């Protein structure tokens, strides 16, 4: 009921520096964080700049993520993300993937402004390189939370240009189909550009069908485009097929 | 006609005559006919009239409405134009006479509106266009603002095409109700009233019509009059002025879009003649740029990508709708996209084959023009209509990317032009294609564009004046194969045999520009011995310039000093170069020179950060050739600036929200002080400013002091002084600076200077959020109050950064000298700079010096750690570093102090001494401190030693960073990032390494600046991007600048860049012209009252300190001089007053020999030869002065060397006990018109000034009338005490007991001095030699 016992007891238990008094000092900050985040931030910051351990920032950020103060949790996370003498602080144990998980739970369907979300995706992709998985995820988010004009055009172009795997073509096909009337010059020529997609056995029909069923009126181009996207070897009736 | 002009002045209006003749319109018209009409508006005529004050003494003080005529109007306009050129306050007569100001504006407007080439000739039309441009651009004047109010108001748009006004009101429904208010308010109006209102509203349209018709009245090739071209160019200049001024454009831009000056301009032949209308069409490109500049018409704010794209696409959408409804042929053009109709290329493939009536009806449907009647032919050509429609609905560039792709170096099409960069032979009868930096910009990108234009013009001057330096005694001649050849020998120009690249290293992180770009230039000096010696004596950071020319004038062509020397010599490229030294036998630049055998010397130079990056970017993007390779010569006596400006321009430019308005000049200029920054400190720590409570209450002359504790004997603290926010209460509350242990040598340093109430309030406005400009007049203790404010900000701020910025090294070193006695830790100071820095301060605050002191201090901390631990009685033979020292604090000192704390604060004076185990740790300290007399004070001392050990542990904690930073510059980066509490730099260094610190630890919480006047507009606007915003807001909280508008400003590269764009107008000067608060201290103590009077009457209530009033030595008699300030007449000697033996190298040998005799008199009278300052009117004058000194005195055992034989601009930051001034100028006023140089040359002597000059020629200046009154306040002769040695106990007012000397000629004065020298040579002798 008074901070006097807390402070004096902590100091007297801290007279030695063994693994004793640790889970009485830090859970003291845990139970102090109630209705007062200032002593919580105080213990967190002074601890991350206090007695050495790699578990220090671990317990600090793991106690702070559970409260209404989370940028302080991310601050202890950033202390770990620099760490000044150990890039890998914990071996197989993860801090950066967990930071990416918290960034995912923040870009969860709360901040749907569609800028913080893609920023958090680039932040996770910077903290750790993403082998096509978060790449397809962020490409789909960037094609869905865009518009239909040259904004979606550049979105699809940059996505396909730096893409890693397939179904990115399907993402840009969804974009092109939703925007199939974005200019009164071509009516979203991205449809034909994606009917001309990868040569041998990837989709060869997906973007063409999306363009021909935007709702439906008449493709008049997707047939030629899909049949120009790599039929069988050169000398055959492929020419007659292109002629019909 | 100089005779008749001077006679008319001296008879009727020239000052310095008891009687003035009455006014006469006949006299005015006669003199006007005999000068202006007869001489085609001669510059020398208007300049003799400006020396006579023809405006402020004849024109407006005696003009009248029935008297205002052609001659009077033309004379007033010509005089105001000449004053605008000569850069002196011009509109003083108008601000004196508001009665005739609307009449004068009305007559000028009538002349500018009436027929051209009629009564008012084309020269008069150019004069009227220039007067209109000036009276529009000076809009902050009351009378000119009122004149342009009804002439540029929102009802000015009442004359544009009716359909265009209707479409405007349809797009802006808010403006229709305002126009309704105007139409209803014009109901009760008079015929003359409403008619003049309409004429004012349509005067802009009528002048646009006159200018466009004047241009169209020119044929394609047949030579035309350049005066009509000057008229049209001054019209374009007025249009650019009202396009750069925000509210001047608010209504003007609608009529601009109405009449489409762009289409007619870019369709006329005057823009197609690359000779007759070249700079006109260049200003026309800049004018189209300001016309399409993204600044929204409704808000005055820029447009976004979405906004501008929607505007363009909606224009193309209205074109599609007008095509569908009214254009059968453009069916595809209607059903086409934005991407397919917005570009001029495809839009032209559609609407080029369009017919005359087709495009005319298209413009009618787009309300661009009056509709075409049925089947009739609008007299506008197909070219005109298609050009209009393409310029309206064509693709335009983003200004950001357009400026981004720009080359930061001048090319072979720019470097040798005086049209966008006039040279040092400027006249002033025309304008150049330059921007303006005076009051306010339309957008931040616009301000930055004008700044970078001025920077490129100054670098163009540095590349243009010295490019014609290839062998340049006699204009270097050509050789076979077009090669270069030096057929003659020059002193300050020499054939550089070659130029080679040595060091082009990496740039700083992130940036686009290398840091050290070095090139070595080799010259085989087969030259005269002493001249080649002055050429070989190269020094550290010495300035040279490599010249390269593309000559075509073959061997033997003589010079014509009138023509452009640039075009005479055919120069190519000039590169400034700071040679670190010449090479030796070991190839390494001269850092005693070693024995140089041979004549060829190579000097390795690196003048700027992006030195070998400007020509690099040139040959990268603009396809230009190599400038560092075609070099031909070396000659002795801003690309990084542009790249930093570009970093800012493409940077998010997120400034402080209360500094956007100040740096914009629009909005409330008094908003950025403490009184309107809403977060001022309630009870703040001004610890340093007051030393006594009575003195604090005296420095609060307007405050009611609520003193918390009445006790007089206990109250002189760093007392908390709260200003209210009942309504005037200064809460003075006592405190006690916490203890520090036993050591009395740990006395926290308190300041000893009694800064008066104005300095206290200035420091308070600096440390209360916002910004502040402390006007520090000479001697007010500006840097003292600055350091005191930094101290108060260190009292109120433990973690924030105090970024000290200065304009020169003087202010920075003085700041170090004042922080030398401030209670600051030496691990908290950091500093930036421009290379190798001579630390003129006591202890080195330099990078390596502070890093080595940091290592030593961490060693000391380890010593204190070992002492405390061994005292506590540990085991061990091994040593622990700073990490284990922090752990040692936490492990042992925590435990000991914790036992003591939970023992004592849970309790007697005996336990105060018992429960402290720190006896053996204080075993080296004064006698046991916890006296056991008072428990609280005993615990104060004990816990103070405990927290002394704690601060030791914190020093070791901050030193583990130096234990972790292996390298010297690495520890510098780390300790400048983290522990640095105050970071001191120069403006050029800050702008050259801005991104360096930005990515290496930039934090800007409060910036304190010194010499705010000597940093430019851009050179101060650059540190506005010393960081980035922090999660959506810039960390910049406060800015306390010490400045003075009355001191010398930056002296620009060319006099033409500041003659063209007024580069002398600093940010503080524009703030003064706006009305921002100026905390103007007035307590000076460096010069006496009666001697400082030559500079005090230049400021606002400039006063003195008790030191100045009571000084026993500053009220003393001058050694052999009865008058403290004499500027005596210097007659013509041997027929020579001022002469120019070299082109414009002004000197006056009469006054010069007088001044040399004066320095000799101070020497042989005992006034110390090191107290002898020779300040002059010209550097050539000071050179001839040193010549006469070393020719008549030489190495005399009776006379030493003057302190500063220097220039009025080159003697700043300094004072003197006795200054000898050689003010040569008598036939022309020169550049004394600057109040800056006036106050400079007047405030450089603290106890005595002795000058030789022309008294009447000085008093002939209108700007210097209050100067002349006290300058010639004494007789104009050498009135001295001749036989009086240095100590003569009399004061300034006492009676002397010896004979007084009155010398009237320099021969006779020098003869007196020479007889004195012979007498002393025959009566004494010295031996020091």
Swiss-Prot record, chain A:
The chain holds residues 124 to 367 of 855 of the full protein. Involved in pre-mRNA splicing as component of the spliceosome. Involved in transcription-coupled repair (TCR), transcription and pre-mRNA splicing. It comes from Homo sapiens (Human). This is Pre-mRNA-splicing factor SYF1. Belongs to the crooked-neck family. Associates with RNA polymerase II, the TCR-specific proteins CKN1/CSA and ERCC6/CSB, and XPA. Identified in the spliceosome C complex. Component of the XAB2 complex, a multimeric protein complex composed of XAB2, PRPF19, AQR, ZNF830, ISY1, and PPIE. Identified in a pentameric intron-binding (IB) complex composed of AQR, XAB2, ISY1, ZNF830 and PPIE that is incorporated into the spliceosome as a preassembled complex. The IB complex does not contain PRPF19. HAT repeats lie at residues 1-35, 37-69, 75-107, 112-145, 147-182. It is found in: Nucleus.
UniProtKB/Swiss-Prot annotation, chain B:
Signal peptide: none annotated. Residues 1-398 are annotated as: Helical region with structural similarity to ARM repeat domains. Gene3D superfamilies: P-loop containing nucleotide triphosphate hydrolases. The modification N6-acetyllysine is found at residue 999. It catalyses: ATP + H2O = ADP + phosphate + H(+). GO terms for cellular component: catalytic step 2 spliceosome; membrane; nucleoplasm; nucleus; U2-type catalytic step 2 spliceosome. It comes from the Eukaryota. Pfam families: AAA_11, AAA_12, Aquarius_N_1st, Aquarius_N_2nd, Aquarius_N_3rd. GO terms for molecular function: 3'-5' RNA helicase activity; ATP binding; ATP hydrolysis activity; mRNA binding; RNA binding; single-stranded RNA binding. GO terms for biological process: mRNA splicing, via spliceosome. Its EC number is 3.6.4.13. It is an enzyme of class 3 (hydrolase). ATP binds at residues 754, 759, 779-784. Residues 399-1329 are annotated as: Required for assembly of the IB complex. It is found in: Nucleus; Nucleus, Nucleoplasm. Keywords: Acetylation, ATP-binding, Helicase, Hydrolase, mRNA processing, mRNA splicing, Nucleotide-binding, Nucleus, RNA-binding, Spliceosome. Contains an N-terminal domain with structural similarity to ARM repeat regions; this domain functions as a scaffold for protein-protein interactions, but is not required for RNA binding or for ATP-dependent RNA helicase activity. Involved in pre-mRNA splicing as component of the spliceosome. Intron-binding spliceosomal protein required to link pre-mRNA splicing and snoRNP (small nucleolar ribonucleoprotein) biogenesis. Plays a key role in position-dependent assembly of intron-encoded box C/D small snoRNP, splicing being required for snoRNP assembly. May act by helping the folding of the snoRNA sequence. Binds to intron of pre-mRNAs in a sequence-independent manner, contacting the region between snoRNA and the branchpoint of introns (40 nucleotides upstream of the branchpoint) during the late stages of splicing. Identified in the spliceosome C complex. Component of the XAB2 complex, a multimeric protein complex composed of XAB2, PRPF19, AQR, ZNF830, ISY1, and PPIE. Identified in a pentameric intron-binding (IB) complex composed of AQR, XAB2, ISY1, ZNF830 and PPIE that is incorporated into the spliceosome as a preassembled complex. The IB complex does not contain PRPF19. Within the spliceosome, interacts with SNRPA1, SF3B1, SF3B3, SF3A1 and SF3A2. Belongs to the CWF11 family. This is RNA helicase aquarius. It comes from Homo sapiens (Human). The gene is AQR.
